[PDB]
Every structure is written in structure tokens, then in C-alpha cells.
Design a protein around this ligand. Sequence first.
Ligand SMILES: *Cc1c(COP(=O)(O)O)cnc(C)c1O
Ligand SMILES: *Cc1c(COP(=O)(O)O)cnc(C)c1O
Lengths: 397, 397
Amino acid sequence: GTFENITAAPADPILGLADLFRADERPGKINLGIGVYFDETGKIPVLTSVKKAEQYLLENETTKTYLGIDGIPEFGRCTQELLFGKGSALINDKRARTAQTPGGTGALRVAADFLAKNTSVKRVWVSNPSWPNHKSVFNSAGLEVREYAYYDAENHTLDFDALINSLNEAQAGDVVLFHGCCHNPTGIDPTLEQWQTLAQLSVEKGWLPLFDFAYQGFARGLEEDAEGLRAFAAMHKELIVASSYSKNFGLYNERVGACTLVAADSETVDRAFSQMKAAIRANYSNPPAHGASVVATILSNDALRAIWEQELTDMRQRIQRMRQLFVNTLQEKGANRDFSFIIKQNGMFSFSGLTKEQVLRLREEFGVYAVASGRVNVAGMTPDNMAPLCEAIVAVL
Amino acid sequence: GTFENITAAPADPILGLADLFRADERPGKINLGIGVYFDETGKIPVLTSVKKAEQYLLENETTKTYLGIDGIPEFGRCTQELLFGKGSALINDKRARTAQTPGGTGALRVAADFLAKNTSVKRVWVSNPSWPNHKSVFNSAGLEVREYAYYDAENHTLDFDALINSLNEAQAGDVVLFHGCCHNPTGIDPTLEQWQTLAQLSVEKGWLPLFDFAYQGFARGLEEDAEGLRAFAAMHKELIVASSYSKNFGLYNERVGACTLVAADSETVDRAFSQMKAAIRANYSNPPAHGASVVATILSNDALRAIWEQELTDMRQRIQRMRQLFVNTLQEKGANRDFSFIIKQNGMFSFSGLTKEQVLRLREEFGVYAVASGRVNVAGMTPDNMAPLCEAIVAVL
Ligand SMILES: *Cc1c(COP(=O)(O)O)cnc(C)c1O
Ligand SMILES: *Cc1c(COP(=O)(O)O)cnc(C)c1O
């Protein structure tokens, strides 16, 4: 029997938490786990721009015939503009090629498969901490994962000196992974000056930069959030960007992402992209149309784009209001620890500083669900659940 | 430069054909390449049942939050009933688990990664000829692919004696891949008696059967086309089914498929399935909702399901009428080679028996596009293009 001696896999630290939450029969349960956006009423809504684009598609789509391996061309063009900005030299020099992928995760795996099967790359460097699924994606393609220092847990800040010292061990030809903005799980991003230091260091050391860009627009703004990436794009001959539209379009389950390859010149990137397409063909063949068609419809229509940008701004500002409310409410409810570092962190997530034992108590005794690392989803907080959430946190301190 | 030593990959023998066809500016060009269904007017339509389901989803969807790793529960249940039959003991005994995947290709890749990482499987046996992407998918997980004999190119039939003999060296614990119906590319399927003989041999030799089911309903009907799989399922402890809804729902670009694991008992299949979910999480994370939501809506609603089944019948019957018209028109246009074997083949495709040289002449000289193996898509034939198509074939014979 071929399956008889298979060992059971452990649950995913994020998606397995979601299974527990669903089964929990207590009415007061609060979900601060998976990184989705909740509105002020505690639902996970479909954006109006998205509903409008879907209505257009329903009434005008005449075929579902296969897309090309790399997806909808306009989707690729609009993605490169978002990442690199209109009039970028990378675009005018035809140094970049984009494949539409099933989510940001699919873009990460396509990049990993492409690298493992066509280059001499063996190692990927990931921040400590990072998104837990980074290691699994890269290991599954056959690549070793190494960790570089990032978070100073005593000061709740970016330990830039520790980051640079640990990365000096990364060799030429190694891949180093950066979060473009809204670092998952810490919410601590480099400043523009720090980005520029890392870019120049990356050139001098011969690293291959890989950017995971899942939160463009949730820190400061669409253009501002790409400053770090663009400082790298100005200096490097080669880079890879794995981007996601799951969160900034609320299109999580339609699986909309992109893998963008950059090389020294047009001939080289086309040669490389041909092997990226072969790796896609042997994975899922070609990408799902519905979600990407929605994104392409919104980004190419000035009226729909204006609505979407306002909806994204509203999401970003609601999270910022909850960060403030969370800190103020913790003080009212009797916390004596200072939680003001929460205000300095960007995006959906903050490292709360709670221990695994406290996170477990919160779930079992109070029905508050966070990830075991102490990562909390601030976008899961609402004016209505803030008081019970904070009473529960104070009770486990 | 990391990308400098990269060797270019050739174009896909099937999907690259569409790129050439698109670039051909000559009027009257005819596309008999990729395996999509064309209607009598040469279009690739969206089914009415699909449009109705998409309207229901637009009106009633309130969130796009992530699906579970394995997708929509109802989709998995309806898939199992389609494959194994309502009231199957496999279902009643809870011996089967199904993951929603991005197309049939995604189901094959998920199975490949699962096998490579969690079992002692080292070798997959596929028919000669087969779909060209089979070897690429299993090789992407590091599995050796061997070929078994299948097609009698002299008699245009299944060479069952050579099939049996050429599988003599397939060992216990090897995977043997079978097309469930409508063999791609030959259109030649085993008879029920041949399936039963293969089922008995597979058990005695200890093979792990893997069925690729991309065309259920295109040979004789939904239940009839599953007879071979059900003969295998009655006798085996373990098997894998990779199925696609791309073609029988006309949902190609929404990437709707399923990977079904079957084990000896519920405890075993649940343990194995946890590792399949881990392999999905490290690839594309979770599957695209839109296409699978359409299928689940249609299969779970008596009225929509009845519309869809009639639409599938209409597709199947138009292809059968084009098979007959193709043979008759070849005779009318002066072919001396007997093409009557075309009538005995099932599904969208027939091996025409044309050489690579003749297929090239058809493209370059006449604007008629087939796959270089001589596979022609009969579903691309219409009353309007049949006569020029046949005149071109006669010209290269
Ligand atoms: C959400 C996320 C991803 C995965 O994005 P998907 O589009 O859901 O696959 C990858 N990396 C980070 C840092 C993320 O936050
Ligand atoms: C079409 C086909 C596939 C792939 O199906 P998709 O759903 O497009 O990924 C796999 N195997 C065979 C034999 C096919 O004909």
C-alpha cells in the first residue's frame, strides 16, 4: 500500500487557525488571524469597483477560451506600471516581462521553480521573522532557506545593524527576499534611506533581489509604497517581483497575482521568460481569468480606477484608526505596558509581544484568535469588538 | 549575471500553435490545433448554464475571502458523485478526498508533488502517444516517466497486445496513467472488457493507477464514460483521479479541476490528504473560486444541471456529425486514402496519420493549423470550412 505509511502533516499556522475559528461555537469569538480586511461591521466585503467590473464581464464576455501561458497582456502592462511607475526606463527598455499567476503565492512558487530548474541558485535569504509560508514555498522547489536578522523585539524596531551584519554571509548568486512594504508579520519597513543603502549593498555583493509585494497601497500610498522597489530597480541588472492583488483589491479567493522578471536587456529577459513559461505550463498550464480580468478592467478605466483608489484609501485609513483606538483602549482597560509601538507599524499586522502561552489562553478562554507568534490582524478590529478584545488581552498580561 | 547561462525553451507544441495562428495574416486560415470546442459558426461560446450561474453568483456573493486549501466542499462532493456514481461504496465508506485545483493540469501537478515528497513512487508510465504535457508535469516533480505502447498506427486501433507486453516491467508501486475516455490524441479508448482486463492486471501487479479525466461526457455520456474508472475503483485499495471541467463546461480559462485521492479506509485517506493540502499551500495556496463556484451551482441545481447536460449532448453530437462529414468530404474531394477509421474515434481529436512534413505544408501553404503529431481537432471543423480544409489535405497526400 503506497499511502499506508504517510505521516500526517501539521496544520498551517495561519489557515489552520481559520479552521479552528469556524468550528468554535461561542458567539463572542473574534478573528485576528488570517490577513483579510474586515470593514467596520465585521464583514469581509466585495469592493464596489469589483462588483461593477464583474457586472461588465458578465454582460460582455463571449468566450472562456484559454488565456496564454502568461495571462492577459493588459494585466501585465498595468502591473509593470504600478510597480515601476509610468515612463520607467525598465519598461521603455523592454527589460521586464510579467506572467499573471494564481495569487502572490503562485508567483513565488513560479519564481522558485524557474530559479531551481534553470540557474545555479541554491539559497534564498528570508527575514527573521517572515510569512511562515515563505520557507515552505522555497523548500518545495528544492531551495535552501537562510534567515537574516530584522526585528529588535526589545525596542520593537528594525535592527538595521544586525540586518547588514547577518546578510554579509550571503554570497554572489544568492537570492535575498525583501517585503516591498507592510512587512508580514512585524509591520516595520525600512526607510527610503535604508532601502537605498540595501540596494547599493545588493549591487556590490551580487545578490539577486526578490520582492514579495502583497500590500502595495496599505502603508502610505500606491506610489510611495513602491519607493523601495524602485530604488532597487534603478541599480540592478536583474530582479524578480512576486506581487499580489488579493488584499488591495479584496480578491483573495480569485487568485490574482503576477511574477515579474527583469534582466539586463530585452534579449536576455525574453530568453529567461521562455523558461518561466515552461515552468508555468508544467504547473497549472495557464492562469485563471476572472480575477485578473476584474483588475485589468478597473485599472484601464479611469472612472473605475478612481473608485478603487478611494476604496483602498478608506481601507488603509480604517486600519490606522484601529491602531490608535487599540492603543488608547488598552490603557483604559488597565494595561500598564506601553503599546505605543503599535502606532509606528504599517499595514494589517503588528507583533503584539504576547507569548505563545498568552495567545493560547486568549483563544481557549476568551475566543480571541491570533497567530501563535503573537501576530494580530488590526484590520480584524472594529469599534464593536475593541472593548472585549482589550479586556481579554489585559486579563492575560 | 544570474540569467546569462539560461537556455531558451522551445514553444509549447500545442499552446504555441495559437501564437502562430494569431500572427498569420492570410485570409481563410483554419485552426484545428488546441483542444477547445467550436460551435457551427467557428466561435468558442460560453454555455447558457454557465451564464445563468454567473448571474446568480454576481447577485448573491457577499465576500471573496479565501477558500480553504481544498476548495469548495460541495464541489468536491459533486465531483465524487460524477466520477464514482451516486451511492458508490467508495463514498459511503469515506475512502475518497477531493481537492479543488486550478484545472486538470493543476490536479496532475498536485498529485505529482504529493507523490514525490510523501511516497516511494519514482516512476510514472504514460501511453505513447499521450498529451505532451504529461511528461513535463511529472518531470517537474523529479519523477521518471516511461512510455507504454498504445496505438496501432496500421489498423488505427488499440494495440492491446503491445500495451500488455510493454507494461510487463512496470513494478509494484509504480504509477500507471490512464486516460478515462477520449484518449488524447488518438481518440481510441479501451472497451469495457479491456478496462476490466487492465483492472485485474493492475491489482495483480500492484500498480498505483492515476486517471486523467479531461473529457467526461464527450465519448458516449457522463455515466458511460466513467465505466472504466469504476471497474478500477471496484477492485483497488488506492487510486488517484485528476479531472478537468475545462472542456465539458467550456470553462477553460477559469481553471476548474479536481484531484481525488482514494485509500483503503477513511483514516488512511485523511492522513494522506493532509500532505496533499500541504503541497497545495506551498504551490498556489488555495484555488480560484469563480469557475468552481459555477460548476458547483450547476451540479447542485436540478434545472441548471438539466440545461448543462443537454448542452453537453449538443456538443458531443456536433463533433460526431463533423467526423462523418469530414470522411465524406475527403472522398468527394478525391482522397484515395481510406479515412473511415475517423468515425470509430471518440472525442475532439483524431490522429490523422499525416506526417510532420505534411502538417508543415498544410500550415505554410494552406493556412491550416494542426499539431505536428498529426492530431486534428474535429471540433474546429464547420460546414463552412470543411470543403477548403479537405481540399488542402488532399493536396498534401
Ligand atoms: C498574502 C501574502 C502572500 C500571498 O498572497 P496570495 O495572493 O494570497 O497568494 C504572500 N506574501 C505575503 C507577505 C503575504 O502577506
Ligand atoms: C485538457 C487536458 C488536460 C488539462 O486540462 P486543463 O483543465 O486545461 O488544465 C489534461 N489532460 C488531458 C488529456 C487533456 O485533454
